[model samples]
Target: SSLTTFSKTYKPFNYPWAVDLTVKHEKAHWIEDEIDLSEDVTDWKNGKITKVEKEYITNILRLFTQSDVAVGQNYYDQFIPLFKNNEVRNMLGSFAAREGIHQRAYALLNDTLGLPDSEYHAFLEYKAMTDKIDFMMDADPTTRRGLGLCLAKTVFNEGVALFASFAMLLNFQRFGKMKGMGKVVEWSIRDESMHVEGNAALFRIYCQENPYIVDNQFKKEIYLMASKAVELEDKFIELAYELGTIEGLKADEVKQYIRHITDRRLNQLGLKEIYNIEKNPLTWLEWILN
Candidate 1:
């Protein structure tokens, strides 16, 4: 059976990018223990941060906390077995592990900051939050649904979900708040950047090997899926901005960044750019991330 048989060996990996990504994941390995949130606790309890800011941070963390578990489970339980390539599967192993680590980090942050358990539960149940997970879970890995699933994962990781949350967290860092928690967010962003790269590479490779995956009809489905992801993300941003703005971030700018990043992901997949925004609105994010 294909399940028990090894179609390709890692010793002579067919994809150099997969091996390179695996090495990068190894180097980027980190744990929640390495970060201490004591200072963040102090800042929160001392009232050094505003209520709106704390609300913004908590909402961002809640979304991440809920989505990480979903992404991790989908990657491991659903997406991993869909691959015949050992190297690709090997890279996904690291991806799955990192997702677990990310969830733990967010959970720790939630508890340390004394966020209400009920509020966290509320976030988990949010329609926008659960909608992405439902879409991913409903996708069948063995069919054309897999392509939509892969593209949706890319948009979620690189465009809508990870980058937006990271940008908000880093903005808090910029204001000299949540400095301790920022370290964990930094590590997560690093891992996710690699994830975006790996997924884009995998998507390209899959499309190349199975040209039928990118027919006119499939392209249309991908475009619609990508647009749907953006719409969901837009709703999220609207709610996030409603909680009010942080010092270094603007609502319009964040929305534009979403469109811009979405375009970049589309370009990565050799698809047409969907948004008009040409440049990243958050240039400081590059500096901080670097």
Candidate 2:
């Protein structure tokens, strides 16, 4: 009974996810439609972008573009073995398809900023980034629990780690620093917000189908896994702010912001809280949507 699917992986006309888990919409955003990079470059020429600001951008962009990319898998087809229903391929592929704009968006920022290669490679090879990815992939992909872990880890990356960095650009906008760049950042925030939503929904449906994996031992495992990921997130976030500070963007508050997100992610994963952060401290920045 635990093997939940019938023949063809879609023979059942009705299932828990047939209606609820299907994607209701698609978004395709263009970098040119949302931003004018030349303006940011102009500001750069005029020294409006501080070295510290560029430093922040490079480090975070490395994480977004190079490391745990905004949409990390072109190999979404390969992930099909992990799902009982092959129809989930469409769901998973959309995950990558939606990220097409994300990939283009980050690269545009990188290209316009004229970032150097040395630091780029350094973050790619950074110990924390490697460590985090290793931790997420540690589980065997053959099992449903592995997919569960994968979904949660991806949520952790997009929701807490990736989304937190966008706040810096919001801070810059607050001070009239980099309006052009901030617009892109704001657009990305909206995009990434949607990215996490799909992962969370899929996690729920997967757990519903494979309810056997919802053991107390598994619950304990995910809690420790989340704590460890939080520790690594601390390292990455600390590394991101090494250059200098912005006015509204404080390191302490950023840590709190991720903690809040981590708790939200935990809830989405059907787990209880570790960080115990109740309210989102970055409330003002929440409306940066466009």
Candidate 3:
């Protein structure tokens, strides 16, 4: 039956995992106003940050701003309507709100750095990001084929996109620069960690509920899409770090960290780990963010 109304008595607790995730997400609530960017602004104005650092930081913010807006819309327009379960819908609503929060934070950071609005939106045209966006956006979300595409996109966003920027921002924090913006990044990462888990769980649930979606052909497409995502991200990482290393973090380390998190994403989705690295090369990031 079509869900005409969301019942008030629909208790998410009946769906234990969904309820668990919902409560955890509620506890992780945050807003952009909670962060103070005064010091970061001062640093930028006083030339305490180098041109390379500014360039890298701006690029990260720009890319995330575009991606976050796209993901937020995708969740609301594509993923939410497909589910009749109120609990899942509620959780996805919160997820969409978090994405909005992330976009606001990105905008604040960009403004604080005095970056031009033109340059910020220009990132959307970059071939690497544009290609991934096109692939995911073009998929029909209500079908199994579309779900597979969205799942792969989520893995890339949460695992690769978030991790790369988080590592770089934390490195600045480690070196005693951009501490204020670092706090914002830390909170954002915590939120994304939950998003990663939630999306992975939803993917698994979808596969189980519709066993037909897990055919060999579907699995092959998922694997191929994931591989392509990694390849595109490699190109992005190279471009992001071309300015030079920040606080002794090289491009190679960032790329490796991306693979490590990608492997973790695959594992969460019950897929094989493709990367040879057994542990996260940027393990220090875990401690630093904490």
Q: Identify the candidate with maximal lDDT.
A: 3
Model 1 worst lDDT run, 10 consecutive residues? 1-10
Model 2, range 161-209, lDDT digits (tens) per residue? 5555677767777777778778777766665666577677777777887
Which portions of model 2 miss their true places by more than 4 Å? Answer: 1-25, 31-34, 68-71, 74-78, 84-87, 119-137
State the C-alpha lDDT per candidate: 0.72, 0.65, 0.73
lDDT of model 1 at residue 197?
Answer: 77
* Candidate 2 lDDT (Cα, 0 to 1): 0.65
Model 1, 118-204: lDDT tens per residue?
A: 445224434555475556555666675465456456545554554565677888778788987888878877887788778877777
lDDT of 3 by residue, 89-158 (tens): 7877888888778778878887777877554432343555656556565667767667755766675666
Return the TM-score for candidate 3, rounded to 2 decimals.
0.88
- Cα lDDT for residue 24, candidate 1: 77
Better of 2 and 3 by lDDT: 3
Q: Over all chains combined, what TM-score does candidate 2 have?
A: 0.81
